[PDB]
Design a protein around this ligand. Structure first.
Ligand SMILES: *[C@@H]1O[C@H](CO)[C@@H](O[C@@H]2O[C@H](CO)[C@@H](O)[C@H](O)[C@H]2NC(C)=O)[C@H](O)[C@H]1NC(C)=O
Lengths: 186, 48, 124
């Protein structure tokens, strides 16, 4: 056996029909003689190599962007309050709803996902990180309520606790409310 | 408090500005895309 | 597909920038935006048995769906900025003279009116 090659390469691509998901980069050919493992005779094999690359525009526009937007929106919602001197809401329902919405998107478009147990694909690594920061975010938002409710016991914060608070605020770009200034003056 | 009232009205005027602006964008995007697609569909239907 | 999403987007836009009282604290509006995005995301990908699903170009229907998503996502951020502006009155610094001057002339074109309690405060 011997190979016959074309002008552009070993495999003719002049009448190829373009695919909507894959693109052909190149082709190779190799002729090899192999030995029988029982006899002192050879046989000829022809190897054809085809290199194809995926087109990620559909996945980028359909999965990555909506989840990134939703995660950012949830992050903004977690740490925003209408009034400084007011009790805050649970924020647990918002986190569960965000997780439910993101869980719906990943597994219901899973007709095209790899679904492999050999390794963790790039898209899989991206989705897990969004889940953890949402799950960690709902716990961090709950800790703010616990700190705020400590004022119902009647013990003022420690001197060092208040000292550290007043210096981080200028870098944080937060300002003391008017009613708090009036309490100090009184 | 007069200070609170003044900032309350600033947000009220700003909110209505957003309402007017976001409906213009919605009307242009929804009507414009669908009407453009129908025009292409209509011409090829009747010119062939 | 086109009609239900257009109706939902318009309803969400109306809900984003509507308040019961001018002199009152507003709600988060974040949950409404997420729910609207979740509802719209459900419709596009669960009827996707007939969608093109191509990576060569962006079809006309795909371009329509993206624009609705951005204005909803931008709308939830714009609604959050109204709360931030309103809460600036808790610091005690009155708005600048030029800020209040510009506010009173846009209002007649905007078709908004000053509340009675605000007029009484000026008189007092
Ligand atoms: C069958 O194929 C083998 C492939 O290895 C051939 O082995 C070559 O033999 C020559 C001498 O005849 C050496 O100079 C080469 O180095 C060998 N190849 C390699 C890769 O080492 C063999 O000649 C072929 N024909 C037979 C066995 O009749």
């Amino acid at each position: 056996y011997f190979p016959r090659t074309f002008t552009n390469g070993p495999i003719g691509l002049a009448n190829f029909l373009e695919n909507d998901a894959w693109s052909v980069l190149g082709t190779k050919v190799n002729r090899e003689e192999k030995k029988y493992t029982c006899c002192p005779v050879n046989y000829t094999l022809l190897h054809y190599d085809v290199v194809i690359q995926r087109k990620p525009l559909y996945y980028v526009l359909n999965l990555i962007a909506p989840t990134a937007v939703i995660t950012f929106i949830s992050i903004i919602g977690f740490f925003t309050s209408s009034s400084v001197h007011d009790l805050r809401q649970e924020k647990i329902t918002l986190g569960i709803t965000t997780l439910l919405s993101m869980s719906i998107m990943i597994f219901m478009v899973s007709d095209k996902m790899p679904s492999t147990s050999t390794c963790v694909p790039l898209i899989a690594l991206f989705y897990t990180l969004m889940i953890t920061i949402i799950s960690v975010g709902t716990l961090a938002a709950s800790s703010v309520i616990f700190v705020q409710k400590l004022g119902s016991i009647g013990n003022p914060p420690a001197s060092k606790t208040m000292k550290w608070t007043h210096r981080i605020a200028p870098f944080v770009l937060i300002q003391m409310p008017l009613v708090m200034k009036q309490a100090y003056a009184k | 408090n007069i200070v609170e009232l003044e900032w309350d009205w600033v947000a009220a005027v700003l909110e209505r500005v957003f309402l007017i602006f976001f409906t213009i964008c919605f009307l242009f995007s929804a009507i414009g895309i669908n009407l453009y697609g129908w025009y292409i569909w209509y011409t090829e239907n009747h010119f062939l």
